[PDB]
Design a protein around this ligand. Structure first.
Ligand SMILES: CCCCCCCCCCC[C@@H](O)CC(=O)N[C@H]1[C@H](OC[C@H]2O[C@H](OP(=O)(O)O)[C@H](NC(=O)C[C@H](O)CCCCCCCCCCC)[C@@H](OC(=O)C[C@H](O)CCCCCCCCCCC)[C@@H]2O)O[C@H](CO)[C@@H](OP(=O)(O)O)[C@@H]1OC(=O)C[C@H](O)CCCCCCCCCCC
Ligand SMILES: *[C@@H]1O[C@H](CO)[C@@H](O)[C@H](O)[C@H]1NC(C)=O
Ligand SMILES: *[C@@H]1O[C@H](CO)[C@@H](O)[C@H](O)[C@H]1NC(C)=O
Length: 144
């Protein structure tokens, strides 16, 4: 069984897919509306997920790669303290997450080639990996 590839969406300037990295865990459904443009766009992220850890204190380690050039790690805490928190933050092992989240993507200019972002989802203190996803964002070869 060859490793399965997941497509999220194509925009006018990007083609977005991902695969599961590290240990294969519970699956995740990820949808983006409208599809992100590398040159910048905003929209809504829909997530359908049955988690195997509690989403409490969820953060991402982001490893971004720009045409094979690795950038230094980034951290972005998602679930922080008390409220101003997404409702899914209070989700527990086994409780369906079925939410939509707003996003704004500023965008890169002069974009070309291929980008990668590996998303290490860590949550549930005691802190263990929730999921790992490696996104591949192709720049459409026929668009700037
Ligand atoms: C990764 C591809 C997956 C498919 C797309 C999913 C949609 C999410 C994309 C959103 C990312 C952008 O917000 C980041 C961005 O553009 N950053 C700019 C930055 O801009 C200012 C801020 O803009 C918004 O805030 P305000 O409107 O309040 O000002 C950003 N905020 C939001 O958009 C709102 C939320 O924060 C969005 C988070 C949604 C994720 C939650 C998912 C929950 C899953 C749990 C359920 C189980 C704000 O963003 C932040 O503060 C941090 C935020 O968390 C972003 C990171 C989230 C993780 C993304 C990984 C995908 C997770 C999906 C897994 C399910 C911004 O700070 O402005 C600066 C300028 O000062 C600009 O930098 P410069 O370009 O240097 O100026 C930023 O631009 C960049 O960072 C681009 C870099 O150059 C990298 C180029 C790579 C090209 C794309 C490859 C992938 C990179 C993804 C991370 C950058
Ligand atoms: C999305 O873009 C990819 C890469 O350019 C391309 O191979 C694919 O055909 C596109 N998807 C569809 C079904 O248009
Ligand atoms: C998830 O919520 C959506 C609305 O975003 C709803 O249409 C759908 O039925 C839900 N999925 C479930 C619980 O199967």
């Amino acid at each position: 069984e060859a490793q399965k590839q997941y497509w999220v969406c194509n925009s006018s300037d990007a083609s977005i897919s991902y695969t599961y990295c590290d240990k294969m865990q519970y699956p995740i459904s990820i949808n983006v509306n409208p599809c992100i443009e590398l040159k910048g766009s905003k929209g809504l992220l829909h997530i359908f997920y049955i988690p195997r850890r509690d989403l409490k204190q969820l953060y991402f380690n982001l490893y971004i790669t720009v045409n094979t050039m690795n950038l230094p790690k980034r951290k972005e805490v998602i679930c922080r303290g008390s409220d101003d928190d997404y409702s899914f933050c209070r989700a527990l092992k086994g409780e369906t997450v079925n939410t939509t989240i707003s996003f704004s993507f500023k965008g890169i200019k002069f974009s070309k080639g291929k980008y990668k972002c590996v998303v290490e989802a860590i949550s549930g203190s005691p802190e263990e990996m929730l999921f790992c996803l490696e996104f591949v964002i192709l720049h459409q070869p026929n668009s700037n």
